Scaffold this active site. Structure first.
Site, short mmCIF file in Angstrom:
data_model
loop_
_atom_site.label_atom_id
_atom_site.label_comp_id
_atom_site.label_asym_id
_atom_site.label_seq_id
_atom_site.Cartn_x
_atom_site.Cartn_y
_atom_site.Cartn_z
N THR A 94 41.09 36.31 40.01
CA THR A 94 41.05 36.46 41.45
C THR A 94 42.41 36.36 42.15
O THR A 94 42.52 36.62 43.34
CB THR A 94 40.02 35.45 42.06
N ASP A 114 42.00 38.94 60.43
CA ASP A 114 41.50 37.98 59.46
C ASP A 114 39.97 37.85 59.51
O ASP A 114 39.34 37.52 58.51
CB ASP A 114 42.15 36.62 59.68
#
Ligand SMILES: *[C@@H]1O[C@H](CO)[C@@H](O[C@H]2O[C@H](CO)[C@@H](O[C@@H]3O[C@H](CO[C@H]4O[C@H](CO)[C@@H](O)[C@H](O)[C@@H]4O)[C@@H](O)[C@H](O[C@H]4O[C@H](CO)[C@@H](O)[C@H](O)[C@@H]4O)[C@@H]3O)[C@H](O)[C@H]2NC(C)=O)[C@H](O)[C@H]1NC(C)=O
Ligand SMILES: *[C@@H]1O[C@H](CO)[C@@H](O[C@H]2O[C@H](CO)[C@@H](O)[C@H](O)[C@H]2NC(C)=O)[C@H](O)[C@H]1NC(C)=O
Ligand SMILES: *[C@@H]1O[C@H](CO)[C@@H](O[C@H]2O[C@H](CO)[C@@H](O)[C@H](O)[C@H]2NC(C)=O)[C@H](O)[C@H]1NC(C)=O
Ligand code: KIF
Ligand code: CA
Length: 475
Positions: free
Chosen positions: A466, A340
């Protein structure tokens, strides 16, 4: 070959849809480990709405109909939780709008009930109407966290860059489809402050701006430059608005080009141990932050899109470098899924990662994977723009790794450590973007050509929001 792979992705989607329908529908999401439900998105059924555009593209009529019928009974005026203008816009608004453009266009022969389809636009309008008061501030910069019943807010003094600059695509699309200019005016007014930054010190380099905006005057409150979460989406939409309508948003393009060039010249960064890898750093008052996030990996895709649309080989080249870097974070771990967040600052390499750093080119700051799609997203554009098979294989390699380490009996779960066997421990969490993005980009990479596919040059008739929801271009 690709057909078999395309079918493989449809099976993974169906798998998650069955588990969701079985234990959580119509709640926002399935909790993939306990086989339960959660409502992190106001309870209107986030996973169902986010899955719409993907189901339509996959040609799954049964799923599409079930979703349309649920959209018809949603009452967007009621929710027990505060609402995020940004999250609600990119998932629900864009999701219904996408379904509408898709079913009204390239997928017109998929569903019969024309009333359920028209209902998508009606509900999109009802949603915008309940949220538009968020824009009623002194500058026009909205409050992102609002209470739709009392019309109250967070009390916040500033609004983030991404949460402010990632609304224009869908709100303008709503105006274009309804004929009501109010939606486009509100979002575009909020966006105006981002296109002409003040103070000038809030724009350290041409096109690169600060991370937060004062709601009272619309001036930037800091000069922290970054493409990371909280900022990301702002730059993404700059170029996408141009693709949507080059006649109306030529100005957005110019701003993106400035941002793209300054990013190449100043944010470009190479790890000490691996000069051959390229990542983007953050900048604040002359100091560089040598770390990045999975979220930031959407960057390669942005450079590739603008690159092909503007016929700028230098943006395409740089975009490919960003794609390579993100691919590096994926194929260097045990699970073959990237972390991440990571870093490459020589002075902060953790003692227990010293050797990993020397060979991989970075150390892991957070090794969790929460079903994010950015890396696969950029791989997808790389393949559409270059036509090279290698990028398609990287999408596949990533999909198999996700299917193998994240899959549960009911769906897919977030994982705690991508650098440990089987991903460490599973989180009881499955975000709606699993349906909307991970599954869509993975499928598109192996599916046949169509209007909804990303195209080179000026041939795009659809542009992706998005949350991976394809919106039809203007005119
Ligand atoms: C795990 O991740 C690795 C990191 O991403 C990945 O490594 C490779 O990934 C790319 C594989 O295609 C590779 O990129 C290519 O590199 C080619 C060679 O580069 C060398 O020569 C050039 C000279 O021009 C130097 O500038 C470079 O520094 C380097 O020394 C390059 O020829 C090629 O470019 C052609 O293709 C592109 C489109 O694909 C065109 O735009 C371009 O015009 C050329 O036609 C391309 O850039 C990358 O270099 C390499 N990364 C590294 C650092 O090793 C692994 O493949 C991956 N592992 C697995 C198993 O998946
Ligand atoms: C949004 O604002 C409304 C105000 O109408 C809040 O409503 C609640 O206000 C009190 C909070 O405990 C109580 O009177 C009730 O729970 C309820 N009453 C009203 C005015 O309807 C609501 O809590 C706010 N939303 C949230 C949860 O943030
Ligand atoms: C993704 O994972 C699933 C489940 O592990 C794979 O499907 C399996 O389905 C059955 C068990 O669930 C068995 O038939 C096999 O274990 C497997 N299917 C096959 C190929 O026989 C699925 O294949 C995985 N996706 C890919 C493409 O690897
Ligand atoms: O910060 C975030 N931005 C991204 C969004 O743009 C979208 O891709 C998903 O909501 C999700 C995907 O990683 N989003 C985030 O959590
Ligand atoms: Ca995104």
């Amino acid at each position: 070959s690709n057909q078999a792979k395309a079918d493989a992705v449809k099976e993974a989607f169906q798998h998650a849809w069955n588990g969701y329908m079985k234990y959580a529908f119509p709640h926002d999401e399935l909790t993939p480990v306990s086989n339960g439900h959660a409502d992190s998105r106001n309870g209107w059924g986030a996973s169902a709405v986010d899955a719409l555009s993907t189901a339509v593209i996959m040609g799954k009529a049964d799923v599409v109909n079930a979703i349309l019928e649920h959209v018809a009974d949603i009452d967007f005026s009621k929710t027990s939780d505060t609402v995020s203008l940004f999250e609600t816009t990119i998932r629900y608004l864009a999701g219904m709008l996408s379904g509408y453009d898709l079913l009204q266009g390239p997928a017109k022969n998929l569903v019969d009930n024309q009333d359920l389809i028209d209902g998508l636009l009606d509900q999109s309008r009802n949603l915008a109407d309940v949220l538009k008061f968020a824009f009623d501030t002194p500058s026009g910069v909205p409050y992102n966290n609002i209470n739709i019943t009392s019309h109250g807010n967070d009390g916040a003094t500033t609004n983030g860059l991404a949460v402010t600059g990632t609304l224009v695509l869908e709100w303008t699309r709503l105006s274009d489809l309804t004929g009501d200019e109010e939606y486009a005016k509100l979002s575009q007014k909020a966006e105006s402050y981002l296109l002409k930054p003040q103070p000038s010190s809030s724009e350290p380099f041409p096109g690169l701006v600060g991370s937060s905006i004062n709601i009272n005057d619309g001036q930037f409150a800091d000069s922290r430059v970054s493409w990371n979460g909280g900022d990301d989406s702002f730059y993404e939409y700059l170029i996408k608005m141009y693709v949507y309508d080059p006649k109306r948003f030529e100005t957005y393009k110019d701003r993106w080009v400035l941002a793209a060039e300054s990013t190449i010249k100043h944010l470009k960064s190479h790890p000490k141990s691996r000069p051959d890898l390229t990542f983007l750093s953050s900048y604040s008052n002359r100091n560089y932050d040598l770390s990045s996030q999975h979220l930031t990996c959407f960057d390669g895709g942005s450079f590739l899109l603008g690159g092909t649309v503007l016929d700028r080989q230098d943006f395409i080249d740089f975009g490919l470098e960003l794609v390579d870097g993100c691919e590096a974070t994926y194929n260097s771990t045990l699970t073959k899924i990237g972390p991440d967040s990571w870093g490459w600052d020589p002075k902060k390499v953790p003692s227990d990662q010293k050797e990993f750093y020397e060979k991989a080119g970075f150390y892991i700051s957070s090794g969790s994977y929460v079903l994010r799609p950015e890396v696969i997203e950029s791989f997808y554009y790389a393949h559409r723009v270059t036509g090279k098979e290698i990028y398609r294989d990287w999408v596949w390699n990533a999909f198999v790794a996700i299917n193998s380490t994240c899959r549960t009996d009911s769906g897919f779960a977030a994982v705690s450590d991508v650098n440990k066997a089987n991903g460490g421990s599973k989180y009881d969490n499955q975000e709606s973007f699993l349906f909307a993005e991970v599954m869509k980009y993975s499928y598109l990479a192996h599916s046949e050509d169509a209007a909804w596919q990303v195209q080179k040059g000026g041939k795009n008739t659809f542009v992706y929001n998005t949350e991976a929801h394809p919106i039809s271009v203007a005119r």
